[PDB]
Design a protein around this ligand. Structure first.
Ligand SMILES: CC(=O)N[C@@H](Cc1ccc(OP(=O)(O)O)cc1)C(=O)N[C@H]1CCCCN(Cc2ccc(-c3ccccc3)cc2)C1=O
Length: 106
């Protein structure tokens, strides 16, 4: 159950995800997964980043789920579950702003 996952914040807004992530104590890769405001059946992986150009900032990645079963940000790299997706991106940055590190504090 994704609702069982501590990083799954459910039905929170994009502005709210940003408020929680834009905390000076959050290292790069601090994250949370929430429902998408705009796409039914889709989720959003919100991630904190930091660089000298932009300072502390947030990136949002749409996660799609096939009726066929797979979860993915890019269709070339799919997972059998949202949890396997989160585990993969915690080890590989690939196209993300940073690999996922720890769950966002509320
Ligand atoms: C308005 C906005 O912020 N849009 C997001 C996408 C997005 C995210 C959530 C969402 O619901 P909400 O309405 O609930 O918020 C709507 C749109 C976006 O555009 N992100 C960027 C993220 C940084 C990379 C650029 N990009 C394209 C891209 C390119 C490569 C990858 C990629 C990631 C991992 C592995 C391989 C490729 C991901 C995104 C985005 O989508």
């Amino acid at each position: 159950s994704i609702q069982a996952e501590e990083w799954y914040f459910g039905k929170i807004t994009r502005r709210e995800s940003e408020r929680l992530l834009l905390n000076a104590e959050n290292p790069r890769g601090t994250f949370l997964v929430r429902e998408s405001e705009t796409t039914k059946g889709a989720y959003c992986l919100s991630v904190s980043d930091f660089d000298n150009a932009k300072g502390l900032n947030v990136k949002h990645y749409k996660i799609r789920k096939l009726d066929s079963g797979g979860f993915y940000i890019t269709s070339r790299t799919q997972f059998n579950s949202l949890q396997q997706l989160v585990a993969y991106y915690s080890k590989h940055a690939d196209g993300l702003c940073h690999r996922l590190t720890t769950v966002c504090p509320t």
